[PDB]
Amino acid sequence: MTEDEDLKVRKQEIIKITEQLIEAINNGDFEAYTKICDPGLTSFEPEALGNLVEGMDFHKFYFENLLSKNSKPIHTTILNPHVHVIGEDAACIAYIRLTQYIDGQGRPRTSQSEETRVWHRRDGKWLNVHYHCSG
Amino acid sequence: MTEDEDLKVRKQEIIKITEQLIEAINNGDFEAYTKICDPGLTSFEPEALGNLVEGMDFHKFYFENLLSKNSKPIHTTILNPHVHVIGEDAACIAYIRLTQYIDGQGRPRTSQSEETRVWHRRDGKWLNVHYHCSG
Amino acid sequence: TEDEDLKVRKQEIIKITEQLIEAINNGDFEAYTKICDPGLTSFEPEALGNLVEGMDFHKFYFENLLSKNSKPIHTTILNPHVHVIGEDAACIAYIRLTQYIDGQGRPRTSQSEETRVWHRRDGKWLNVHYHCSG
Amino acid sequence: MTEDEDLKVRKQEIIKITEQLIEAINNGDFEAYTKICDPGLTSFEPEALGNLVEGMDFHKFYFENLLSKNSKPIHTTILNPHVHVIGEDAACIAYIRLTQYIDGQGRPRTSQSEETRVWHRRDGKWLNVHYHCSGA
Amino acid sequence: SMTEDEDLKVRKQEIIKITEQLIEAINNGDFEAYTKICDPGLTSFEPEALGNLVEGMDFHKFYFENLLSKNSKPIHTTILNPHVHVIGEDAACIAYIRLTQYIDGQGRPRTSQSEETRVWHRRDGKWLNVHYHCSGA
Amino acid sequence: SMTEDEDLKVRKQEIIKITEQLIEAINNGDFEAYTKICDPGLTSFEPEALGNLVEGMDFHKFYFENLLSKNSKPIHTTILNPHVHVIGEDAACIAYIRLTQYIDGQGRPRTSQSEETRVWHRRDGKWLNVHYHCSGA
Amino acid sequence: SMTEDEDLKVRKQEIIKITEQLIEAINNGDFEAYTKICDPGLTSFEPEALGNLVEGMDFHKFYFENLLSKNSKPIHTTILNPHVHVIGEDAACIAYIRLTQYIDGQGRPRTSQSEETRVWHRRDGKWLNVHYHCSG
Amino acid sequence: SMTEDEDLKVRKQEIIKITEQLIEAINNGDFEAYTKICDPGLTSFEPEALGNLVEGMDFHKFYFENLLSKNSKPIHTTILNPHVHVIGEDAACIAYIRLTQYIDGQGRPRTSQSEETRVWHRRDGKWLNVHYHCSG
Amino acid sequence: SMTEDEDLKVRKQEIIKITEQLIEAINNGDFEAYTKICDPGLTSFEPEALGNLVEGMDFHKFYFENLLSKNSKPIHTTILNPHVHVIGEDAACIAYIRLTQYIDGQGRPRTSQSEETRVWHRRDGKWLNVHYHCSGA
Amino acid sequence: SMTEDEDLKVRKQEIIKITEQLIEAINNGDFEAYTKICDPGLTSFEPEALGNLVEGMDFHKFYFENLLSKNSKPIHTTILNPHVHVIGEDAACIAYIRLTQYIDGQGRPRTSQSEETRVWHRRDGKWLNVHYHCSGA
Amino acid sequence: MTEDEDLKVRKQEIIKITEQLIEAINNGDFEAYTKICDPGLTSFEPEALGNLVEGMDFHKFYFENLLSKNSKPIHTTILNPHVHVIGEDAACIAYIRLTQYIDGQGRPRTSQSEETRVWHRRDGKWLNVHYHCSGA
Amino acid sequence: TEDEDLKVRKQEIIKITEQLIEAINNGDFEAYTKICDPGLTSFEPEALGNLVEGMDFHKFYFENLLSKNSKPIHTTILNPHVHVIGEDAACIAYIRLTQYIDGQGRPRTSQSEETRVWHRRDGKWLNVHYHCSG
């Protein structure tokens, strides 16, 4: 195995798990969510109003009160992802997320956000330890 | 050495280098900047308008045309930093940056931004591989 | 016969652009996918300054809007211009006025400026790129 | 593979020429501009206010009164270009353009625009026949 | 015969009458009346055309199909300070201000002003509107 | 016929040429040229008249005395998609879009669009503008 | 003189009473009363006429047909600081501020101010409003 | 009757000429001319009086002292669609639109529209403005 | 003196009590109570009078007929930092800030501040409000 | 003696005169005149106090030191529709609208309206302003 | 060290009680609220419009008409608290409060406020004597 | 003597708060640091919703504004209220009106609401916390 092919595989490994995380969010599967996220997950994101939050407590609200409750359609597009492999057990993904969705008044709309996720493999499982979202 | 004290030291290691990076930016020292940044540095930041940029090319403009040129005072404050140690050679810092500065019309002002920097130690030197800034 | 040749090809590109727009208005995704290249790229307002692979991105508007709509709309194509770029390539630029009826009862117009790039593969014209501003 | 390498080369051909066109615009070289553009160039762009213009007449103004005038720095970045090769003599490039520049108030700013250029090779030279720009 | 002046008065009145009839047909949503008074090649500049020149017969269909016909709501049109240029035996041109009193969605009554030019061509004894320019809002 | 279509083409071009000359006269601030091409009874709807119909010769004097003649700053006018209605031997009508590139107060170059109607009347062998309707921001 | 000052007072009062009666007719939606008090040639400058001078009798019909009549919502009109110019035996002129308290769509009560001029002409022993200028 | 229609025309013209002369006096900043044409008891509703009725002669002094005089910047006034009501031998009333072309602070030329009412009273053979209502 | 300071304190409290009662009457929509505490010549500057001085008894009738009496919705008034000027045996003056907590149209609770002056005149043993100045958003 | 009515007229005029003198002292930036006419315990509600009641003598010093004194620029004050309440031999109260014509920074002349209440107390033969309420803008 | 552990304990004491106060407010328990607050509590807060209020009277309204009324979910997060121990019987806490909640339009939203509470222990019970809230 | 005691301590806190404000207005940082606890924390508008260690954060305003300023300013303290929290602790809440002169010539007012918490250590009152809204 060349290190080029090796690097491609690892990079794909991080894309797949990032995509699964996003699926768990969209479906409102908090058990899947907690399984993929490190319990010490920290987050910068618009809803946290410029503060760094412990993501596991702060995100419970969106699952209890929105994401599981919805059956309205939403299509997520991940654009131009870039993965930094930082040794055997650490990685980092930066990507643009376009989300098509339907608004309360019925119309369909799009939103863009720019997202960073930092990944740590512990005991054979990749876990998200940090998340930065802007939009 | 307990792993608690060990972890504290590594965490401090990342704070010091993040602070030095910020000093190099404020002074407009691009040579210091390039020494601390990985050549493959990627960045999400307000000036990149929602796109991911190769940070070394995109940042040259701010050094050539602003940061070295200035002697106007600026005080940076780093608030509530949080460091994730992700194995021997990988780390990640999230912090709030308050910058006090003087505006073109003379008045002093403050700006807040929320910042993530991902770090990789290669050949004994810590290098910044990703940067996410919102504000 | 050289000039008349050019006229014909130009009209060929207008007809197919017009059919594409009919497919969109009727919410016919099968017609749409038959006229669009599977690798279609798009710049457009709903993509928020990004270039998208148009076939995945457009599915949403067919599933959730264009097919479930009984409301009248009249499209007007203004001042089209066609560049014939060899036997198998062309390019159309036009203004699109759309008359429609809005939420609060009333009728409105929107203008957009549109570029479509065309490629003939195995005798069928296919849209490979689309740029929309408005 | 060689089918593939061929395609890669053509695609790079169109990127190089697009980049050269942009250099000509930034430097205010109208002679270089007119050499790279088809005389029948059409344009959709923000300054044309929703109209399609014949780009060679409409663009003269910006060369005469702006682009040739300026020694103010500007860095252009081309992000995520995509090229469609549409046969031996036709191609098409879509890209995002970020422009770093300096404003009247003194300060540096960024602008994004999304750009389509359509290309036609006539007598061995690639010429831009259509241009669609959106932004601001 | 008649005074050159009284002749001119007559013609001018002719163009006012026909312009007024056109406006009635529009208000009543009478498309057949409308098409009878408009040249099939009518061109139009108007707010709803967003700065473009449109072939008025296709572009106006939409407002008859979806608004003007189907309306029960009262509207009073006032034509202010019309001016007619008689441009030979078979050509004329009218410029006028149109105030429209009407009732709005939230119930209330409102006024709108628009400034309007209509160019007229008599073909086979019948005056037809060939161009229309409307500005307002 | 072959001869007739060609005749119509020529008259249409006649009206474009004179409209273009009128625009040159305005750009250059040549009021004498302007008054020679305009009917003394010219009426105008235009943004600077604020919804009113004005007698154009008096109203336009101000812009010639205080702006158009004084001006050394560059301006490029583009006429888009003109359409001419020939309304008999002595009457015509042109509708066009005018893009004007120009340089502003803070130094920068800008564009403005306006949609324009001019009505024409040939008197004693000379085409004269009798009405003008201009709409734009 | 003393009995010319009292004479002037009376005439001024005459013009206030008739102006007040006109306003009552408007508030009640009584168009017959309105047309009896207004000259058929009444001209009007007012906010609903959009900067134009209108023949008031045709233009006001709309507000009687479609609003002032079918109203039963309360409204209190206050006339502040009236001033009357007596311009000979048969002509006068009143300038006044009108405050109107009323109830809005949201159910809330509101006030509006307008400044009003009415010009009066006595023809055949009856005072008639010939002109009206309202701003607000 | 025929010679009452011509009589009416003349009087109406009389009122336009004097209104035009008043405006000339205002544009030139001639306060002496102004006070000769206005009744000392002139009242005024106008935008600069902020919804209040002012005694026009004291309130207008400020604009003559501080503006209309020391002006040499060009201004072209157009009076559109005047309408005159003759209210007996000694009273009249004019309603008109005033377009004013002028040059602004930035150096640019601009237009303003205002709708104006002037009420006139002839005392001792001279027409005097007793009331003024301006909106815009 | 000891007795004098105490005298002044009592009169000041007299003026606060009656101001508070006036405010109760307004909140409850009791117009008879209101008219008993107000001088019939009461003048008022207040936001709803739009910069004008009004005769308060006529102007305030509207708010009693159409709002204050109809109202079942809760409101808490807070009077902050009152200041009383005793201006002789029969005249006084109170300035205070009024915070009003209340519930709005979209259901939510809100606060409004206003700054208020009331001038008082004792006639025949009864304090009456003769002037009122209210300022606030 | 004098008519109860003529007596009342006199007193009312007394309060207008003194209010006018206060306004002149303010316009001229005469602080010594100002302090002579104002009670040392003067309280004020006014726009510059941002909804607070201030002790007017300390708060107004700033405008005399830094503005009203040092001004050469013309200003015409108009007092409209004053109303005076005579509240016994030694107490009064005036409500009036103040229109101020003035010249602005960018050169131009402007008007401002404010609605004003002044409460007056005669002590030792001299009328002194004890309270001031100003609303506007 | 034990000097230090002592300080840590007191600081936690003040966090627990502050958190309990916030629970009482969210649940709309006024009885619990009045037990934790000094009767002389003063407050600076957005709803008091720049004024200092006696918090016990002013806060009654929100309990009567809002907080006790609601079964709509809300999650409060206290970020980066800082406690000053100011002697045996006085303390002071500064913290950021993020509140996740659901709005009228249906949607969930966040609000930040910065909060200071000053504490006084009287007869063995900690009481809030002052409160300063900034935000929105 | 119990009530009079309370009055005195309350006035003690007003005087020192007033001195603090004088130090700020004059740009006297040495006076400022002598009256402020080195661990002073602050909530204030220029901190953008964050809690800052006031001694580092305030240095900038002294270095670049408060000392280099000859322009007049009048501070008014309205309706102060002092809570005495034992022998060594107190707390003051007040409204601060500041009259000042602005860039384009003119004079203006600003209001802010201010809390300062005080701790007496070794006989000297020190500000430990500061909350400013406006």
Residue numbers in the entry:
A (entry chain E), B (entry chain E): 386 to 520
C (entry chain F), L (entry chain F): 387 to 520
D (entry chain D), K (entry chain D): 386 to 521
E (entry chain A), F (entry chain C), I (entry chain C), J (entry chain A): 385 to 521
G (entry chain B), H (entry chain B): 385 to 520
Question: Which sentences did the original study use to describe this structure?
Answer:
Calcium/Calmodulin (Ca2+/CaM)-dependent serine/threonine kinases (CaMKs) constitute a family of 81 proteins in the human proteome that play a central role in cellular signaling by transmitting Ca2+ signals. Kinases in this protein family are activated through binding of Ca2+/CaM to regulatory regions that either flank the catalytic domain or are located in regulatory molecules. CaMKII proteins form large oligomeric structures. The N-terminal kinase domain is tethered via an autoinhibitory helix and a calmodulin binding site to a C-terminal oligomerization domain that organizes the enzyme into ring-shaped oligomers.
The discrepancy between the dodecameric (12-mer) structures determined by electron microscopy and the tetradecameric (14-mer) assembly revealed by the crystal structure of the isolated oligomerization domain of the C. elegans orthologue prompted us to crystallize the oligomerizaton domains of human CaMKII isozymes. Here we present the oligomerization domains of the human γ and δ isozymes that were refined at 2.7 and 2.8 Å resolution, respectively. While isolated domains of the δ isozyme were tetradecameric, the CaMKIIγ oligomerization domain crystallized in its dodecameric state, thus providing a model for the oligomerization state observed in full-length CaMKIIs. The oligomerization domain formed a hexameric structure with a diameter of 120 Å and a height of 60 Å surrounding a central cavity of only 17 Å. Thus, the main consequence of the insertion of an additional subunit per ring in the tetradecameric assembly is a considerable widening of the central cavity, to about 33 Å. Each oligomerization domain in the ring also contains a deep cavity that has been suggested to represent a peptide binding site, based on structural homology with peptide-binding domains present in nuclear transport factors and scytalone dehydratase. In support of this hypothesis is the fact that a glycine or an acetate molecule, respectively, originating from the crystallization solution were partially occupying this putative binding site in the structures of the CaMKIIγ and CaMKIIδ oligomerization domains. We used the structures of the dodecameric oligomerization domain, the CaMKIIδ/Ca2+/CaM complex and the structures of the inactive catalytic domains, to construct models for the full-length enzyme.
